[PDB]
Design a protein around this nucleic acid. Structure first.
Ligand SMILES: [Mg+2]
Ligand SMILES: [Mg+2]
Ligand SMILES: [Mg+2]
Ligand SMILES: [Mg+2]
Ligand SMILES: [Mg+2]
Ligand SMILES: [Mg+2]
Ligand SMILES: [Mg+2]
Ligand SMILES: [Mg+2]
Ligand SMILES: [Mg+2]
Ligand SMILES: [Mg+2]
Ligand SMILES: [Mg+2]
Ligand SMILES: [Mg+2]
Ligand SMILES: [Mg+2]
Ligand SMILES: [Mg+2]
Ligand SMILES: [Mg+2]
Ligand SMILES: [Mg+2]
Ligand SMILES: [Mg+2]
Ligand SMILES: [Mg+2]
Ligand SMILES: [Mg+2]
Ligand SMILES: [Mg+2]
Ligand SMILES: [Mg+2]
Ligand SMILES: [Mg+2]
Ligand SMILES: [Mg+2]
Ligand SMILES: [Mg+2]
Ligand SMILES: [Mg+2]
Ligand SMILES: [Mg+2]
Ligand SMILES: [Mg+2]
Ligand SMILES: [Mg+2]
Ligand SMILES: [Mg+2]
Ligand SMILES: [Mg+2]
Ligand SMILES: [Mg+2]
Ligand SMILES: [Mg+2]
Ligand SMILES: [Mg+2]
Ligand SMILES: [Mg+2]
Ligand SMILES: [Mg+2]
Ligand SMILES: [Mg+2]
Ligand SMILES: [Mg+2]
Ligand SMILES: [Mg+2]
Ligand SMILES: [Mg+2]
Ligand SMILES: [Mg+2]
Ligand SMILES: [Mg+2]
Ligand SMILES: [Mg+2]
Ligand SMILES: [Mg+2]
Ligand SMILES: [Mg+2]
Ligand SMILES: [Mg+2]
Ligand SMILES: [Mg+2]
Ligand SMILES: [Mg+2]
Ligand SMILES: [Mg+2]
Ligand SMILES: [Mg+2]
Ligand SMILES: [Mg+2]
Ligand SMILES: [Mg+2]
Ligand SMILES: [Mg+2]
Ligand SMILES: [Mg+2]
Ligand SMILES: [Mg+2]
Ligand SMILES: [Mg+2]
Ligand SMILES: [Mg+2]
Ligand SMILES: [Mg+2]
Ligand SMILES: [Mg+2]
Ligand SMILES: [Mg+2]
Ligand SMILES: [Mg+2]
Ligand SMILES: [Mg+2]
Ligand SMILES: [Mg+2]
Ligand SMILES: [Mg+2]
Ligand SMILES: [Mg+2]
Ligand SMILES: [Mg+2]
Ligand SMILES: [Mg+2]
Ligand SMILES: [Mg+2]
Ligand SMILES: [Mg+2]
Ligand SMILES: [Mg+2]
Ligand SMILES: [Mg+2]
Ligand SMILES: [Mg+2]
Ligand SMILES: [Mg+2]
Ligand SMILES: [Mg+2]
Ligand SMILES: [Mg+2]
Ligand SMILES: [Mg+2]
Ligand SMILES: [Mg+2]
Lengths: 136, 52, 386
RNA sequence: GCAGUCAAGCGUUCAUAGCGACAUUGCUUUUUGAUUCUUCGAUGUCGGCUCUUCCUAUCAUACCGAAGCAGAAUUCGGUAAGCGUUGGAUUGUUCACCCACUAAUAGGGAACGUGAGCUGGGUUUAGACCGUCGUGAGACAGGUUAGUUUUACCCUACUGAUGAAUGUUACCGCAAUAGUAAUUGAACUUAGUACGAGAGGAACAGUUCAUUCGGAUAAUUGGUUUUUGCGGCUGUCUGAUCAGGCAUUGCCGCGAAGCUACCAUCCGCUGGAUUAUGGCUGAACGCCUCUAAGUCAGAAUCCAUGCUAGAACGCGGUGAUUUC
RNA sequence: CUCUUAAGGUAGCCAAAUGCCUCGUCAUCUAAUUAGUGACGCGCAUGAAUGGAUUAACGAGAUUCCCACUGUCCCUAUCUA
RNA sequence: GUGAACAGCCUCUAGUUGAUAGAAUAAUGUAGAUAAGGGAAGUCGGCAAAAUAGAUCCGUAACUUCGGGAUAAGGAUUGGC
């Protein structure tokens, strides 16, 4: 996760190390979300911090609104392509990796999320669930 | 505890088996194994796959 | 001159030396602390691991995102046919430790046990316990005398028992013999329980019940001589490195001028003794039961044995322990199963569990169906049949 | 580089909460120097990588004593090295610096650890360009580009593995000694509570997850494929068919088994004794005093429980012991 | 206007393979750039066949970035001879 | 024969079947392959690897010594009958 969050996330498989570029599913005018950090993370020699669904990452828009690039913002992962196993025993996965810009509280910068959203990501962030289309 | 159907082969997916896939729009897909999933991923047509 | 960055050491230094275990039957090195006010009963049990499979169940964990929710879980089934008391041992506290004082054996030991005492059974006269059986010729006496001795001097009492390996699928005819600590009441009451059970049988529903956490002593699967990368989880050297890279670069500084006991080196991986604790009992199998594999939710008449049979093991004709998750050792190997050394109130350890369904598909492949019945109903009548 | 003694001053007031001038006593050997003892019948150097262990002048974590400690936050100090101390942009760099995460991103040693372990970017052979110097050959503690990294099978060490001799052989055990392990964060709740004019704003108990580490394990999902298991395909060859050969496993799709992944799942014990500190009774000293005698509580400490080996010159209980 | 020593750096060009200071200043690229580029120039110590500036094509030459690609890495696993 | 082909692959005539051999398939290797998600975060530096690739048709930038750049780039297609 990160924080600003309501609740606890059960572990899901990491799929987005740093350097990963994931789609921006909001309406902020940002087409990209480039990951440079993962608020949850811990530390091991050479271990890239990597992120999963519903974590909050630090990021930089690399494509889209000029007023939106050349700066770090927080972002939240709403979809990941890396297969993870939920406690009900099922190994699901999405078709791209997508994220949405947010402030440190968790409050989204936009008001719409194109595409589906993972329940874990939604339960963790009320405001992501608010503006979500479909969940899971 | 439900049992779903493969969305290609029409096989029986028991708990924990197979894989689940969430396409672009939002249609949810299910494969009982790496076989039906691989065929789906090559875009084979089940109506042409003998054992379906 | 100080490692540039810190990292933790690789491997645990308390599972040394990383050699091959002595016995293939792992030792119980500890038994629970005896409360001598409960009935007499074994404290561990002999069994052969068969395989694994999947469970479903609701969760009972108030405050979890999965409370009152289905979860699927891997379980392992160990083939546990009743065990047979063939003797008793008397241990005495001494300023040099516990000591075996005498041992009193039963009058008739089966071939399963007799076998153990031989290396070439087929060409032996099978003279095993023939002159000891003569001790029973007398009214009692010699046996009664040594039984009286344990009652007077022993401070702990262990029964000898052995697997009935013949009830199982294994090619091994030779049965495994083990000491087990008696933890019922009075030292007197103990050997009595033991004498009373000579040649007789004990099942697992008399030791372990459902929702019990148990420990699981066993010898780990072997892999022979291993390089330091997979044996220790050592990092893999760059690709450019001359002379290979599944090594470690620095075996040591100049001083001490000696390879040190703690740097990682190639050699044996596997076949190690592990005591693995807090495995919760999910189902106690009844052998006679035709509904081993069934549930109060899924009522269909099936047994635990998966379709096609447990891979590399066989079928489960007998009583079995279903344990959550996994267990050291591989299929076919003996496993001592032991009661907890402590009273856990994990909540995770007090949860009463009730399964909803037990995966009974083939493991020898991507199994689709649970029962031969179900295969038929689904595929219809084939070119064979009728 | 680090630490003291004195106490003029800083500190609204007040030397010493936290600092501390003039002076003064010391410590360290990851600075730099001084020296030139050792090695010139020689065998490179810097940095990094990898990995282990040690120091403590402690950054984080545990428990405390202080405060100019209301709360939160911080700051000083004690016991403390048990346990962690990271991902990156530019640089050959160590260093430096910036981004970022974080409980924290402490400082050092082990031939300025570590080249028959790597790498070879830098430096520092021979090729070459520039600038400065020189009449010149050439020079530069200037810039630049290209420049071969040898051997272990010996001994010891370390890791694993057999093994003679204690009548013979077999089974079941003991436990000396040695090793040893877990780690840290968050949420919910306590509670918008304590405290506070307000701004703000805790903790224990309880619950749920997670990070780092570890030991296993393969039901599941994923990876691997000479199952050359099944099918597909090109070229050629066996007159055609059928069925096959060859193409250093011809190529493609699936592919059980085995192996295997924080890419998968399971599991990681609880009693005591103490430290700092706070006290108890209590003299010395008819008072006072945690201390002198005696004594209570008490920490990531220690010792056990537990866990791995089992002394091949440590031991116990038991079985059977030869006519060809 | 003057001094050394004959003249006194023109056209150009540049922190350039020539710049000590130096990781120069400004702009740009980046989350961050002792790197790269565009500029600036009292330039330690640029400069006109001791050739200066320009330049299409060419290069197993030195250098920076982008797309593609990827086991280089995260973080390792499996197979063949 | 395939094919642009004295290429690669397969064959005929002719010539060899000769390079100590047997049993196993630990580590670490030398040579050959493959990897979920990410995609240079590895590193002095994309070193090594990967990706592209024939042919037909369409299409094709700055600049230029007008010759080039240029297979620039970017696309569609391809068996059998
Ligand atoms: Mg690194
Ligand atoms: Mg800036
Ligand atoms: Mg598979
Ligand atoms: Mg060092
Ligand atoms: Mg250190
Ligand atoms: Mg050990
Ligand atoms: Mg290895
Ligand atoms: Mg492992
Ligand atoms: Mg090399
Ligand atoms: Mg090594
Ligand atoms: Mg290594
Ligand atoms: Mg198991
Ligand atoms: Mg299987
Ligand atoms: Mg004053
Ligand atoms: Mg004061
Ligand atoms: Mg000298
Ligand atoms: Mg000297
Ligand atoms: Mg010498
Ligand atoms: Mg100290
Ligand atoms: Mg005051
Ligand atoms: Mg205050
Ligand atoms: Mg505050
Ligand atoms: Mg403050
Ligand atoms: Mg101080
Ligand atoms: Mg230490
Ligand atoms: Mg750093
Ligand atoms: Mg971090
Ligand atoms: Mg030194
Ligand atoms: Mg050195
Ligand atoms: Mg060396
Ligand atoms: Mg060398
Ligand atoms: Mg070099
Ligand atoms: Mg040179
Ligand atoms: Mg050079
Ligand atoms: Mg060269
Ligand atoms: Mg060697
Ligand atoms: Mg040895
Ligand atoms: Mg110790
Ligand atoms: Mg509230
Ligand atoms: Mg106030
Ligand atoms: Mg024919
Ligand atoms: Mg025909
Ligand atoms: Mg041939
Ligand atoms: Mg693990
Ligand atoms: Mg005291
Ligand atoms: Mg005292
Ligand atoms: Mg006193
Ligand atoms: Mg502890
Ligand atoms: Mg333990
Ligand atoms: Mg022993
Ligand atoms: Mg011994
Ligand atoms: Mg003894
Ligand atoms: Mg003159
Ligand atoms: Mg002029
Ligand atoms: Mg002119
Ligand atoms: Mg200049
Ligand atoms: Mg330059
Ligand atoms: Mg420039
Ligand atoms: Mg760069
Ligand atoms: Mg001239
Ligand atoms: Mg000239
Ligand atoms: Mg070229
Ligand atoms: Mg590859
Ligand atoms: Mg590899
Ligand atoms: Mg010819
Ligand atoms: Mg050939
Ligand atoms: Mg000839
Ligand atoms: Mg030869
Ligand atoms: Mg990959
Ligand atoms: Mg990509
Ligand atoms: Mg780096
Ligand atoms: Mg580098
Ligand atoms: Mg880099
Ligand atoms: Mg290359
Ligand atoms: Mg590929
Ligand atoms: Mg056609």
């Amino acid at each position: 996760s990160g924080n600003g969050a309501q609740g606890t996330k059960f572990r899901i498989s990491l799929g987005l190390p740093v350097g990963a570029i994931m789609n921006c599913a909001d309406n902020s005018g940002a087409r990209n979300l480039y990951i440079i950090a993962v608020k949850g993370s811990g530390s091991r020699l050479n271990r890239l911090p990597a992120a999963s669904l519903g974590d909050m990452v630090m990021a930089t828009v690399k494509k889209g609104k000029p007023e939106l690039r050349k700066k770090v913002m927080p972002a939240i992962v709403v979809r990941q392509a890396k297969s993870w196993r939920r406690r009900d025993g099922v190994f699901l996965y999405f078709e791209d990796n997508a994220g949405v810009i947010a402030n440190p509280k968790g409050e989204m910068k936009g008001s719409a999320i194109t595409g589906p959203v993972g329940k874990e990501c939604a339960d963790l962030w009320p405001r992501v669930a608010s503006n979500s289309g479909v969940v899971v | 505890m439900k049992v779903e159907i493969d969305s290609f082969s029409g096989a029986k997916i028991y708990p924990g088996r197979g894989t689940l896939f969430v396409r672009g729009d939002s249609k949810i897909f299910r494969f009982q194994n790496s076989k039906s999933a691989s065929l789906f991923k090559q875009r084979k047509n089940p109506r042409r796959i003998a054992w379906t | 001159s100080h490692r540039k960055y810190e990292a933790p050491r690789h491997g645990h230094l308390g599972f040394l030396p990383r050699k091959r275990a002595a016995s293939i039957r792992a030792r119980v090195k500890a038994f629970p602390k005896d409360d001598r006010s409960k009935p007499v009963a074994l404290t561990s049990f002999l069994g052969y691991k068969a395989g694994m499979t999947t469970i479903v169940r609701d969760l009972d964990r108030p405050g979890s995102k999965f409370h009152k929710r289905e979860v699927v879980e891997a379980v392992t089934v160990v083939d546990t046919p009743p065990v047979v008391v063939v003797g008793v041992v008397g241990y005495v506290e001494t300023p040099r430790g516990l000591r075996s004082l005498t041992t009193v054996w039963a009058e008739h030991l089966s071939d399963e046990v007799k076998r153990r005492f031989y290396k070439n059974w087929y060409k032996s006269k099978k003279k095993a316990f023939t002159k000891y059986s003569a001790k029973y010729a007398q009214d009692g006496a010699g046996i009664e005398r040594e039984l009286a001795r344990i009652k007077k001097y022993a401070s702990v009492v262990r029964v000898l028992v052995h697997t009935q390996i013949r009830k199982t699928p294994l090619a091994q005819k030779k049965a495994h013999l083990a000491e087990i600590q008696l933890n019922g009441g009075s030292i007197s009451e103990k050997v009595d329980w033991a004498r009373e059970h000579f040649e007789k049988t004990v099942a697992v529903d008399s030791v372990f019940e459902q929702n019990e956490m148990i420990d699981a002593i066993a010898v780990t699967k072997g892999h022979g001589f291993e390089g330091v990368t997979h044996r220790w989880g050592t990092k893999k050297l760059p690709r450019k490195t001359h002379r290979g890279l599944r090594k470690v670069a620095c075996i040591g500084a100049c001083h001490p001028a000696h390879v040190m006991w703690s740097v990682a080196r190639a050699g044996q991986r596997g076949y190690h003794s592990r005591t693995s604790i807090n495995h919760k009992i999910y189902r106690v199998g009844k052998g006679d039961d035709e509904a081993n594999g069934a549930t109060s939710f899924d009522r269909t008449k099936k047994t635990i044995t998966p379709m096609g049979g447990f891979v590399h093991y066989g079928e489960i004709k007998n009583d079995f322990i279903m344990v959550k998750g996994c267990i050291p050792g591989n299929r076919k190997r003996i496993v001592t199963l032991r009661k907890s050394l402590y009273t856990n109130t994990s909540r995770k350890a007090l949860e009463e569990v009730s399964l909803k369904w037990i995966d009974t598909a083939s493991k020898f492949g991507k199994g689709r169906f649970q029962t031969p019945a179900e295969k038929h109903a689904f595929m219809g009548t084939l070119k064979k049949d009728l």
